[PDB]
CSV table of C-alpha atoms and ligand atoms in Angstrom, one decimal:
chain,number,residue,atom,x,y,z
A,1,UNK,CA,-93.0,-208.8,80.3
A,2,UNK,CA,-91.2,-206.5,77.9
A,3,UNK,CA,-91.4,-202.7,78.7
A,4,UNK,CA,-94.5,-200.9,77.7
A,5,UNK,CA,-94.1,-198.7,74.7
A,6,UNK,CA,-96.9,-197.9,72.4
A,7,UNK,CA,-100.6,-197.3,73.0
A,8,UNK,CA,-101.3,-199.2,69.8
A,9,UNK,CA,-98.3,-201.5,69.3
A,10,UNK,CA,-97.5,-201.8,65.6
A,11,UNK,CA,-94.7,-202.3,63.0
A,12,UNK,CA,-96.1,-200.0,60.4
A,13,UNK,CA,-94.8,-196.7,61.8
A,14,UNK,CA,-98.3,-195.6,62.6
A,15,UNK,CA,-97.1,-192.5,64.6
A,16,UNK,CA,-95.4,-191.1,61.4
A,17,UNK,CA,-98.8,-190.9,59.6
A,18,UNK,CA,-100.7,-188.3,61.7
A,19,UNK,CA,-103.8,-188.4,59.6
A,20,UNK,CA,-104.1,-192.2,59.8
A,21,UNK,CA,-103.2,-192.4,63.4
A,22,UNK,CA,-105.9,-189.8,64.3
A,23,UNK,CA,-108.5,-191.8,62.3
A,24,UNK,CA,-107.8,-195.0,64.2
A,25,UNK,CA,-107.8,-193.2,67.6
A,26,UNK,CA,-111.1,-191.7,66.7
A,27,UNK,CA,-112.4,-195.2,65.9
A,28,UNK,CA,-110.9,-196.8,69.1
A,29,UNK,CA,-113.4,-195.7,71.7
A,30,UNK,CA,-116.1,-197.0,69.4
A,31,UNK,CA,-114.3,-200.3,69.3
A,32,UNK,CA,-114.0,-200.3,73.1
A,33,UNK,CA,-117.7,-199.7,73.4
A,34,UNK,CA,-118.5,-202.6,71.1
A,35,UNK,CA,-116.1,-204.8,73.2
A,36,UNK,CA,-117.8,-203.9,76.5
A,37,UNK,CA,-121.3,-204.5,74.9
A,38,UNK,CA,-120.7,-207.6,72.9
A,39,UNK,CA,-117.5,-208.9,74.3
A,40,UNK,CA,-117.1,-211.7,77.0
A,41,UNK,CA,-120.1,-211.3,79.3
A,42,UNK,CA,-119.5,-209.9,82.9
A,43,UNK,CA,-115.7,-209.9,82.1
A,44,UNK,CA,-115.1,-206.2,82.6
A,45,UNK,CA,-113.1,-206.5,85.8
A,46,UNK,CA,-111.3,-209.9,85.3
A,47,UNK,CA,-107.5,-210.1,85.1
A,48,UNK,CA,-106.7,-212.6,82.4
A,49,UNK,CA,-103.4,-214.3,81.8
A,50,UNK,CA,-103.1,-213.4,78.1
A,51,UNK,CA,-100.6,-213.3,75.3
A,52,UNK,CA,-100.1,-210.0,73.6
A,53,UNK,CA,-97.9,-209.4,70.5
A,54,UNK,CA,-95.9,-206.1,70.7
A,55,UNK,CA,-93.6,-206.8,67.8
A,56,UNK,CA,-93.5,-209.5,65.0
A,57,UNK,CA,-90.4,-211.4,66.2
A,58,UNK,CA,-90.8,-214.5,68.4
A,59,UNK,CA,-90.0,-212.8,71.7
A,60,UNK,CA,-92.3,-209.8,71.0
A,61,UNK,CA,-95.0,-212.2,69.8
A,62,UNK,CA,-95.1,-214.1,73.1
A,63,UNK,CA,-95.5,-211.3,75.7
A,64,UNK,CA,-97.6,-213.1,78.4
A,65,UNK,CA,-99.1,-211.3,81.5
A,66,UNK,CA,-102.3,-210.6,83.5
A,67,UNK,CA,-104.5,-207.9,81.9
A,68,UNK,CA,-108.1,-206.7,81.9
A,69,UNK,CA,-109.4,-207.3,78.4
A,70,UNK,CA,-110.7,-203.7,78.1
A,71,UNK,CA,-107.0,-202.7,78.5
A,72,UNK,CA,-105.7,-205.3,76.0
A,73,UNK,CA,-103.1,-203.7,73.7
A,74,UNK,CA,-104.7,-204.4,70.3
A,75,UNK,CA,-102.1,-203.7,67.7
A,76,UNK,CA,-101.3,-203.8,64.0
A,77,UNK,CA,-98.7,-206.2,62.6
A,78,UNK,CA,-97.6,-207.0,59.1
A,79,UNK,CA,-95.3,-209.8,58.1
A,80,UNK,CA,-91.9,-208.2,57.2
A,81,UNK,CA,-91.8,-206.5,53.8
A,82,UNK,CA,-89.6,-208.3,51.2
A,83,UNK,CA,-87.4,-206.4,48.7
A,84,UNK,CA,-88.6,-206.7,45.1
A,85,UNK,CA,-91.6,-209.0,45.7
A,86,UNK,CA,-93.5,-209.9,42.5
A,87,UNK,CA,-97.1,-210.9,41.8
A,88,UNK,CA,-97.3,-214.7,41.4
A,89,UNK,CA,-100.5,-215.4,39.5
A,90,UNK,CA,-103.0,-214.0,37.1
A,91,UNK,CA,-102.8,-211.3,34.4
A,92,UNK,CA,-100.1,-209.3,36.3
A,93,UNK,CA,-97.8,-212.2,37.2
A,94,UNK,CA,-94.2,-211.1,37.2
A,95,UNK,CA,-95.0,-207.4,38.0
A,96,UNK,CA,-94.1,-205.6,41.2
A,97,UNK,CA,-96.6,-206.2,44.0
A,98,UNK,CA,-98.7,-203.2,44.9
A,99,UNK,CA,-98.2,-201.0,47.9
A,100,UNK,CA,-101.4,-199.0,47.1
A,101,UNK,CA,-104.8,-200.0,45.9
A,102,UNK,CA,-105.2,-199.8,42.1
A,103,UNK,CA,-108.3,-197.7,41.3
A,104,UNK,CA,-109.8,-200.3,39.0
A,105,UNK,CA,-109.8,-202.9,41.9
A,106,UNK,CA,-110.6,-200.5,44.7
A,107,UNK,CA,-114.2,-201.6,45.1
A,108,UNK,CA,-113.4,-205.3,44.9
A,109,UNK,CA,-110.5,-205.2,47.4
A,110,UNK,CA,-112.7,-203.2,49.7
A,111,UNK,CA,-115.4,-205.8,49.5
A,112,UNK,CA,-112.9,-208.6,50.2
A,113,UNK,CA,-111.4,-206.8,53.2
A,114,UNK,CA,-114.7,-205.8,54.7
A,115,UNK,CA,-116.2,-209.3,54.4
A,116,UNK,CA,-113.1,-210.9,56.1
A,117,UNK,CA,-113.2,-208.2,58.7
A,118,UNK,CA,-116.9,-208.8,59.4
A,119,UNK,CA,-116.4,-212.4,60.6
A,120,UNK,CA,-113.9,-211.4,63.4
A,121,UNK,CA,-116.3,-209.5,65.6
A,122,UNK,CA,-119.1,-212.0,64.6
A,123,UNK,CA,-117.2,-214.8,66.3
A,124,UNK,CA,-116.8,-212.7,69.5
A,125,UNK,CA,-120.5,-211.9,69.5
A,126,UNK,CA,-121.4,-215.6,69.0
A,127,UNK,CA,-119.1,-216.7,71.8
A,128,UNK,CA,-119.8,-213.9,74.4
A,129,UNK,CA,-121.9,-216.0,76.8
A,130,UNK,CA,-119.6,-219.0,77.0
A,131,UNK,CA,-117.4,-217.9,79.9
A,132,UNK,CA,-120.4,-218.3,82.3
A,133,UNK,CA,-120.2,-222.1,81.8
A,134,UNK,CA,-116.4,-222.5,81.3
A,135,UNK,CA,-115.3,-226.1,82.2
A,136,UNK,CA,-112.0,-224.8,83.8
A,137,UNK,CA,-109.8,-221.8,84.3
A,138,UNK,CA,-107.6,-223.1,81.5
A,139,UNK,CA,-110.5,-223.3,79.0
A,140,UNK,CA,-111.9,-220.0,80.2
A,141,UNK,CA,-108.6,-218.3,79.5
A,142,UNK,CA,-108.2,-220.0,76.1
A,143,UNK,CA,-111.7,-218.7,75.1
A,144,UNK,CA,-110.7,-215.2,76.2
A,145,UNK,CA,-107.4,-215.5,74.3
A,146,UNK,CA,-109.3,-216.4,71.1
A,147,UNK,CA,-111.7,-213.5,71.7
A,148,UNK,CA,-109.1,-210.8,72.1
A,149,UNK,CA,-107.2,-212.2,69.1
A,150,UNK,CA,-110.4,-212.0,66.9
A,151,UNK,CA,-110.7,-208.5,68.3
A,152,UNK,CA,-107.3,-207.8,66.9
A,153,UNK,CA,-108.3,-209.3,63.5
A,154,UNK,CA,-110.9,-206.6,63.3
A,155,UNK,CA,-108.2,-204.0,64.0
A,156,UNK,CA,-106.1,-205.6,61.3
A,157,UNK,CA,-108.8,-205.1,58.6
A,158,UNK,CA,-109.9,-201.7,59.9
A,159,UNK,CA,-106.3,-200.4,59.7
A,160,UNK,CA,-106.2,-201.5,56.0
A,161,UNK,CA,-109.6,-199.7,55.4
A,162,UNK,CA,-108.4,-196.4,57.0
A,163,UNK,CA,-104.9,-196.6,55.5
A,164,UNK,CA,-106.0,-197.3,51.9
A,165,UNK,CA,-109.7,-196.5,51.3
A,166,UNK,CA,-110.1,-193.0,52.8
A,167,UNK,CA,-113.6,-191.8,53.8
A,168,UNK,CA,-115.2,-195.0,52.4
A,169,UNK,CA,-112.7,-196.9,54.5
A,170,UNK,CA,-113.8,-195.1,57.6
A,171,UNK,CA,-117.5,-195.7,56.8
A,172,UNK,CA,-116.7,-199.4,56.4
A,173,UNK,CA,-115.0,-199.3,59.9
A,174,UNK,CA,-118.1,-197.8,61.5
A,175,UNK,CA,-120.5,-200.2,59.8
A,176,UNK,CA,-118.4,-203.2,61.0
A,177,UNK,CA,-119.3,-202.2,64.5
A,178,UNK,CA,-123.0,-201.5,63.6
A,179,UNK,CA,-123.8,-205.0,62.3
A,180,UNK,CA,-124.4,-207.7,64.9
A,181,UNK,CA,-124.6,-211.5,64.8
A,182,UNK,CA,-128.2,-212.7,64.6
A,183,UNK,CA,-129.6,-209.2,64.5
A,184,UNK,CA,-132.9,-208.8,62.7
A,185,UNK,CA,-132.2,-205.7,60.7
A,186,UNK,CA,-128.4,-205.4,60.6
A,187,UNK,CA,-127.1,-209.1,60.8
A,188,UNK,CA,-123.5,-210.1,60.0
A,189,UNK,CA,-122.8,-210.7,56.3
A,190,UNK,CA,-122.4,-214.4,56.3
A,191,UNK,CA,-124.9,-217.0,57.5
A,192,UNK,CA,-122.6,-219.3,59.6
A,193,UNK,CA,-121.6,-216.2,61.6
A,194,UNK,CA,-125.2,-215.4,62.4
A,195,UNK,CA,-125.7,-218.9,64.0
A,196,UNK,CA,-125.7,-219.5,67.7
A,197,UNK,CA,-122.7,-221.1,69.4
A,198,UNK,CA,-124.8,-222.5,72.2
A,199,UNK,CA,-122.4,-224.6,74.2
A,200,UNK,CA,-118.8,-225.5,74.6
A,201,UNK,CA,-119.0,-228.5,72.3
A,202,UNK,CA,-120.1,-226.1,69.5
A,203,UNK,CA,-117.3,-223.7,70.5
A,204,UNK,CA,-114.6,-226.4,70.1
A,205,UNK,CA,-116.2,-227.6,66.8
A,206,UNK,CA,-116.4,-224.0,65.5
A,207,UNK,CA,-112.7,-223.2,66.3
A,208,UNK,CA,-111.7,-226.6,64.8
A,209,UNK,CA,-113.8,-226.2,61.7
A,210,UNK,CA,-115.0,-222.7,61.0
A,211,UNK,CA,-111.8,-220.9,62.1
A,212,UNK,CA,-110.3,-223.3,59.5
A,213,UNK,CA,-112.3,-221.4,56.8
A,214,UNK,CA,-110.5,-218.4,58.2
A,215,UNK,CA,-107.2,-220.2,57.7
A,216,UNK,CA,-108.0,-221.0,54.1
A,217,UNK,CA,-109.5,-217.6,53.2
A,218,UNK,CA,-106.5,-215.8,54.9
A,219,UNK,CA,-104.0,-218.1,53.2
A,220,UNK,CA,-105.5,-217.2,49.8
A,221,UNK,CA,-105.4,-213.5,50.6
A,222,UNK,CA,-101.8,-213.9,51.9
A,223,UNK,CA,-101.0,-214.4,48.2
A,224,UNK,CA,-102.6,-211.1,47.1
A,225,UNK,CA,-100.8,-208.6,44.8
A,226,UNK,CA,-102.1,-206.0,47.2
A,227,UNK,CA,-99.1,-206.4,49.5
A,228,UNK,CA,-100.3,-204.7,52.7
A,229,UNK,CA,-103.2,-207.2,52.7
A,230,UNK,CA,-101.0,-210.1,51.9
A,231,UNK,CA,-98.6,-209.2,54.8
A,232,UNK,CA,-101.6,-208.6,57.2
A,233,UNK,CA,-103.0,-212.0,56.4
A,234,UNK,CA,-99.6,-213.8,56.8
A,235,UNK,CA,-99.3,-212.6,60.3
A,236,UNK,CA,-103.0,-213.4,61.1
A,237,UNK,CA,-102.3,-217.0,60.2
A,238,UNK,CA,-100.1,-217.4,63.3
A,239,UNK,CA,-103.1,-216.4,65.4
A,240,UNK,CA,-105.5,-218.6,63.5
A,241,UNK,CA,-103.2,-221.6,64.2
A,242,UNK,CA,-103.8,-221.0,67.9
A,243,UNK,CA,-107.6,-221.1,67.3
A,244,UNK,CA,-107.3,-224.3,65.4
A,245,UNK,CA,-105.4,-225.8,68.3
A,246,UNK,CA,-108.0,-224.7,70.8
A,247,UNK,CA,-110.7,-226.5,68.7
A,248,UNK,CA,-108.8,-229.6,67.9
A,249,UNK,CA,-107.4,-230.2,71.4
A,250,UNK,CA,-110.8,-229.3,72.9
A,251,UNK,CA,-112.6,-232.0,71.1
A,252,UNK,CA,-109.6,-234.4,71.6
A,253,UNK,CA,-110.0,-233.9,75.3
A,254,UNK,CA,-113.7,-234.6,75.1
A,255,UNK,CA,-113.2,-237.8,73.1
A,256,UNK,CA,-110.5,-238.8,75.7
A,257,UNK,CA,-112.9,-238.3,78.6
A,258,UNK,CA,-115.6,-240.3,76.9
A,259,UNK,CA,-113.2,-243.2,76.1
A,260,UNK,CA,-112.2,-243.1,79.7
A,261,UNK,CA,-115.8,-243.5,80.9
A,262,UNK,CA,-116.4,-246.2,78.3
A,263,UNK,CA,-113.4,-248.2,79.6
A,264,UNK,CA,-114.4,-247.7,83.2
A,265,UNK,CA,-118.1,-248.7,82.7
A,266,UNK,CA,-117.2,-251.3,80.1
A,267,UNK,CA,-119.9,-250.2,77.7
A,268,UNK,CA,-120.7,-248.1,74.6
A,269,UNK,CA,-124.4,-247.8,75.5
A,270,UNK,CA,-125.2,-244.1,75.1
A,271,UNK,CA,-127.9,-244.2,77.8
A,272,UNK,CA,-125.3,-245.4,80.3
A,273,UNK,CA,-122.6,-242.9,79.1
A,274,UNK,CA,-125.0,-240.1,79.4
A,275,UNK,CA,-126.0,-241.3,82.9
A,276,UNK,CA,-122.4,-240.9,83.7
A,277,UNK,CA,-122.4,-237.4,82.3
A,278,UNK,CA,-120.2,-237.7,79.2
A,279,UNK,CA,-120.9,-237.0,75.6
A,280,UNK,CA,-121.2,-240.3,73.7
A,281,UNK,CA,-119.1,-240.5,70.5
A,282,UNK,CA,-122.1,-240.8,68.2
A,283,UNK,CA,-123.4,-237.5,69.4
A,284,UNK,CA,-120.0,-235.9,68.9
A,285,UNK,CA,-120.2,-237.2,65.3
A,286,UNK,CA,-123.5,-235.4,64.8
A,287,UNK,CA,-121.9,-232.1,66.0
A,288,UNK,CA,-119.0,-232.7,63.6
A,289,UNK,CA,-121.5,-233.3,60.8
A,290,UNK,CA,-123.3,-230.1,61.6
A,291,UNK,CA,-120.4,-227.7,61.9
A,292,UNK,CA,-118.6,-229.2,58.9
A,293,UNK,CA,-121.6,-228.9,56.5
A,294,UNK,CA,-122.5,-225.4,57.6
A,295,UNK,CA,-118.9,-224.2,57.3
A,296,UNK,CA,-118.6,-225.8,53.9
A,297,UNK,CA,-121.2,-223.3,52.5
A,298,UNK,CA,-118.7,-220.4,53.4
A,299,UNK,CA,-116.6,-221.2,50.3
A,300,UNK,CA,-119.4,-220.2,48.0
A,301,UNK,CA,-120.8,-221.6,44.8
A,302,UNK,CA,-118.7,-224.3,43.2
A,303,UNK,CA,-118.8,-222.4,39.9
A,304,UNK,CA,-118.3,-218.6,40.1
A,305,UNK,CA,-117.2,-215.8,37.7
A,306,UNK,CA,-116.4,-213.7,40.8
A,307,UNK,CA,-113.7,-216.1,42.1
A,308,UNK,CA,-112.3,-216.3,38.6
A,309,UNK,CA,-112.1,-212.5,38.5
A,310,UNK,CA,-110.3,-212.2,41.8
A,311,UNK,CA,-107.7,-214.6,40.7
A,312,UNK,CA,-107.1,-213.1,37.2
A,313,UNK,CA,-106.9,-209.6,38.7
A,314,UNK,CA,-104.3,-210.8,41.2
A,315,UNK,CA,-106.5,-210.2,44.3
A,316,UNK,CA,-106.8,-213.6,45.8
A,317,UNK,CA,-104.6,-216.6,45.0
A,318,UNK,CA,-105.1,-220.4,45.6
A,319,UNK,CA,-103.9,-222.0,48.8
A,320,UNK,CA,-100.1,-222.3,48.7
A,321,UNK,CA,-100.2,-220.9,45.2
A,322,UNK,CA,-96.5,-221.0,44.6
A,323,UNK,CA,-96.3,-224.7,45.2
A,324,UNK,CA,-98.8,-225.5,42.4
A,325,UNK,CA,-97.2,-226.9,39.3
A,326,UNK,CA,-99.1,-225.1,36.5
A,327,UNK,CA,-98.8,-221.7,34.7
A,328,UNK,CA,-100.6,-219.7,37.5
A,329,UNK,CA,-102.9,-218.2,34.9
A,330,UNK,CA,-105.3,-221.1,34.3
A,331,UNK,CA,-106.8,-219.9,31.0
A,332,UNK,CA,-106.4,-223.4,29.6
A,333,UNK,CA,-106.6,-225.5,32.8
A,334,UNK,CA,-109.4,-227.6,34.2
A,335,UNK,CA,-110.6,-228.7,37.7
A,336,UNK,CA,-112.9,-231.6,38.5
A,337,UNK,CA,-116.1,-230.8,40.4
A,338,UNK,CA,-119.3,-232.7,41.2
A,339,UNK,CA,-122.7,-232.1,39.6
A,340,UNK,CA,-126.3,-233.2,40.3
A,341,UNK,CA,-128.4,-234.3,37.4
A,342,UNK,CA,-131.8,-235.8,38.4
A,343,UNK,CA,-131.1,-239.0,40.4
A,344,UNK,CA,-127.3,-239.0,39.9
A,345,UNK,CA,-124.3,-237.3,41.5
A,346,UNK,CA,-121.6,-237.2,38.8
A,347,UNK,CA,-118.2,-235.7,38.1
A,348,UNK,CA,-117.2,-233.3,35.4
A,349,UNK,CA,-114.2,-231.1,34.5
A,350,UNK,CA,-114.8,-227.3,34.3
A,351,UNK,CA,-112.5,-224.4,33.5
A,352,UNK,CA,-110.1,-224.1,36.5
A,353,UNK,CA,-110.7,-220.3,36.9
A,354,UNK,CA,-114.4,-220.9,37.3
A,355,UNK,CA,-114.0,-223.5,40.1
A,356,UNK,CA,-111.6,-221.8,42.5
A,357,UNK,CA,-114.2,-221.8,45.3
A,358,UNK,CA,-114.4,-225.6,45.0
A,359,UNK,CA,-110.6,-226.0,44.9
A,360,UNK,CA,-110.4,-224.0,48.1
A,361,UNK,CA,-113.2,-226.0,49.7
A,362,UNK,CA,-111.3,-229.2,48.7
A,363,UNK,CA,-108.1,-227.9,50.3
A,364,UNK,CA,-110.0,-227.2,53.5
A,365,UNK,CA,-111.7,-230.7,53.5
A,366,UNK,CA,-108.2,-232.3,53.2
A,367,UNK,CA,-107.0,-230.3,56.2
A,368,UNK,CA,-110.1,-231.1,58.3
A,369,UNK,CA,-109.7,-234.8,57.5
A,370,UNK,CA,-106.1,-234.7,58.8
A,371,UNK,CA,-107.4,-233.4,62.2
A,372,UNK,CA,-110.1,-236.0,62.3
A,373,UNK,CA,-107.4,-238.7,61.6
A,374,UNK,CA,-105.7,-237.3,64.7
A,375,UNK,CA,-108.8,-237.6,66.9
A,376,UNK,CA,-109.2,-241.2,65.8
A,377,UNK,CA,-105.9,-242.2,67.4
A,378,UNK,CA,-107.9,-241.9,70.7
A,379,UNK,CA,-110.4,-244.6,70.3
A,380,UNK,CA,-107.7,-246.6,68.5
A,381,UNK,CA,-105.4,-246.5,71.5
A,382,UNK,CA,-108.3,-247.6,73.8
A,383,UNK,CA,-108.8,-250.4,71.3
A,384,UNK,CA,-112.3,-249.3,70.4
A,385,UNK,CA,-113.9,-249.6,66.9
A,386,UNK,CA,-115.5,-246.2,66.7
A,387,UNK,CA,-114.0,-243.9,64.1
A,388,UNK,CA,-115.1,-240.3,63.2
A,389,UNK,CA,-115.7,-239.6,59.5
A,390,UNK,CA,-116.5,-236.7,57.4
A,391,UNK,CA,-119.8,-236.8,55.5
A,392,UNK,CA,-120.1,-236.4,51.7
A,393,UNK,CA,-119.4,-232.9,50.6
A,394,UNK,CA,-123.0,-232.6,49.3
A,395,UNK,CA,-124.6,-233.5,52.7
A,396,UNK,CA,-126.6,-230.7,54.4
A,397,UNK,CA,-125.7,-227.8,52.0
A,398,UNK,CA,-127.6,-224.6,51.5
A,399,UNK,CA,-125.2,-223.0,48.9
A,400,UNK,CA,-124.4,-224.2,45.4
A,401,UNK,CA,-125.3,-227.3,43.4
A,402,UNK,CA,-126.4,-229.5,46.4
A,403,UNK,CA,-128.6,-226.8,47.8
A,404,UNK,CA,-131.8,-228.2,46.3
A,405,UNK,CA,-131.3,-231.9,47.1
A,406,UNK,CA,-130.7,-234.1,50.2
A,407,UNK,CA,-127.5,-236.2,50.3
A,408,UNK,CA,-126.8,-238.7,53.1
A,409,UNK,CA,-123.5,-238.6,54.9
A,410,UNK,CA,-122.5,-241.7,52.9
A,411,UNK,CA,-123.2,-239.9,49.6
A,412,UNK,CA,-126.6,-241.1,48.3
A,413,UNK,CA,-129.2,-238.7,47.0
A,414,UNK,CA,-132.2,-239.4,49.3
A,415,UNK,CA,-135.9,-238.7,49.3
A,416,UNK,CA,-137.6,-236.1,51.4
A,417,UNK,CA,-139.1,-238.9,53.5
A,418,UNK,CA,-135.8,-240.5,54.3
A,419,UNK,CA,-134.2,-237.1,55.2
A,420,UNK,CA,-137.1,-236.4,57.5
A,421,UNK,CA,-137.0,-239.7,59.2
A,422,UNK,CA,-133.3,-240.3,59.4
A,423,UNK,CA,-131.5,-236.9,59.8
A,424,UNK,CA,-131.9,-237.2,63.6
A,425,UNK,CA,-129.1,-239.8,63.2
A,426,UNK,CA,-126.9,-237.3,61.4
A,427,UNK,CA,-127.4,-233.9,63.0
A,428,UNK,CA,-127.9,-232.9,66.6
A,429,UNK,CA,-131.6,-233.1,67.7
A,430,UNK,CA,-133.3,-230.7,70.1
A,431,UNK,CA,-132.9,-233.5,72.7
A,432,UNK,CA,-129.2,-233.9,71.9
A,433,UNK,CA,-128.7,-230.2,72.4
A,434,UNK,CA,-130.7,-230.2,75.6
A,435,UNK,CA,-128.5,-233.0,77.0
A,436,UNK,CA,-125.2,-231.3,76.0
A,437,UNK,CA,-126.6,-228.2,77.6
A,438,UNK,CA,-127.4,-230.1,80.8
A,439,UNK,CA,-123.7,-230.8,81.2
A,440,UNK,CA,-122.6,-227.2,80.8
A,441,UNK,CA,-121.7,-225.9,84.2
A,442,UNK,CA,-118.9,-223.6,85.2
A,443,UNK,CA,-115.8,-225.0,87.0
A,444,UNK,CA,-113.5,-222.3,88.2
A,445,UNK,CA,-111.6,-224.2,90.9
A,446,UNK,CA,-107.9,-224.1,90.1
A,447,UNK,CA,-106.6,-227.2,88.2
A,448,UNK,CA,-110.1,-228.7,88.0
A,449,UNK,CA,-112.1,-229.8,84.9
A,450,UNK,CA,-115.7,-230.4,84.4
A,451,UNK,CA,-116.5,-234.1,84.2
A,452,UNK,CA,-117.3,-234.1,80.4
A,453,UNK,CA,-113.7,-233.1,79.4
A,454,UNK,CA,-110.2,-234.3,80.3
A,455,UNK,CA,-107.3,-232.1,81.3
A,456,UNK,CA,-105.0,-230.8,78.6
A,457,UNK,CA,-101.6,-232.2,77.9
A,458,UNK,CA,-99.9,-229.1,79.2
A,459,UNK,CA,-100.6,-225.6,80.5
A,460,UNK,CA,-99.9,-222.2,79.0
A,461,UNK,CA,-96.5,-220.6,78.7
A,462,UNK,CA,-95.0,-223.3,80.9
A,463,UNK,CA,-97.4,-222.6,83.7
A,464,UNK,CA,-98.8,-225.4,85.8
A,465,UNK,CA,-102.2,-226.7,84.7
A,466,UNK,CA,-103.6,-225.4,88.1
A,467,UNK,CA,-102.3,-221.8,87.6
A,468,UNK,CA,-105.0,-219.2,88.3
A,469,UNK,CA,-105.3,-218.3,84.6
A,470,UNK,CA,-108.2,-215.9,85.4
A,471,UNK,CA,-108.5,-213.7,88.5
A,472,UNK,CA,-112.0,-212.6,88.9
A,473,UNK,CA,-111.6,-209.5,91.2
A,474,UNK,CA,-114.9,-210.5,92.8
A,475,UNK,CA,-114.7,-207.6,95.2
A,476,UNK,CA,-115.1,-205.2,92.3
A,477,UNK,CA,-118.2,-206.2,90.3
B,1,CL,CL1,-114.7,-198.4,46.3
B,2,FE,FE1,-109.9,-214.3,63.0
B,3,FE,FE1,-110.0,-217.4,64.3
B,4,OH,O1,-109.1,-216.0,63.3
């Protein structure tokens, strides 16, 4: 490892700003208390082989070593500042990007930053029980790496709050530790982040699908005229890519194991696959349906004056804004969205500014579909017919125009009776979830993997797959 240096590694000259540094250090012990309370369960004395960034360059990014998570060096890292960067969209296109928050947008920027910050500890809270049933040291270590990274994402947003929003900033930093996933009176802001993540199959789906909402929200904010936010999100995207990998390869390894048992037993009978302790592909498809549809609601209403305002004011851009071939102002542009009118799902064009949530949702759908295309290479290579698919965008939605109807995965509007009698085929049943639960059992033997999942293609940081990625320090409970 590179030589220790700073208590809070950073590339923002934190030490030069005494007032700001003091505010973060006053908040730190509160963060550490939250981490001990709501962080990975019973993990206080584990030594975990973790990656820590200590500077933004490739070498400093990849500082691997054993560390207790309580002692993780959470830091603050902005993509390098560019000389003479201009705003790329909206009313202010062509002007210098902002280094400070414009008073007129203070409350909106604050809202955007806090809502993003809120999802980071929510994922840790949702996932805190999982290590008790980790299917391998490798997977246990990946879970912990995701967790400390989401912890750092909370630091990333709290830094912006303290640095740019004064006393309100600090009050937002405190409340971010007071809310709690699933709590009755102070729940987390967004509904999908108040859901349970009850097993490892849900965990891999969540990091494959819901961390991908993180990618598309962060990619939109990485375009912001408010440059400290833009540069914060650009760096965060490198960590988000790791989360997406954990999710995609996690499910890939599960599909691999189930295809192996299908080949061995020579059957696709789910009763027989389950007798052999694997997760049948159809059940995997239900979990895909579930996490996909719940995540889709995170993009918000298809039509929205708020999203239009964020774009025009230069706060939040479209995904890969600069690659888009239009005027980047959209006053006379359209975008095609669906609509529901009685017994018909139809299409219409609306003003582009009013449908930016739907555009972002569509970008995310395209990305998810690419990952699903990659999973499908597995049955294909085994010569099986099974293919995973994404359901219609209107299936199982609680936000927006499809909220008041039922749509089947194959895109029909369906009756209440048909939803009630058939959705057991489309979303995990209580019984499906009990079966998956029945398979969850810790496996901490080095190089060994629980029977429902295959080994990964390679280890971490060139270590053998049977490396002791976690040391439990059992003598010191
Ligand atoms: Cl404000
Ligand atoms: Fe995150
Ligand atoms: Fe993430
Ligand atoms: O993330």
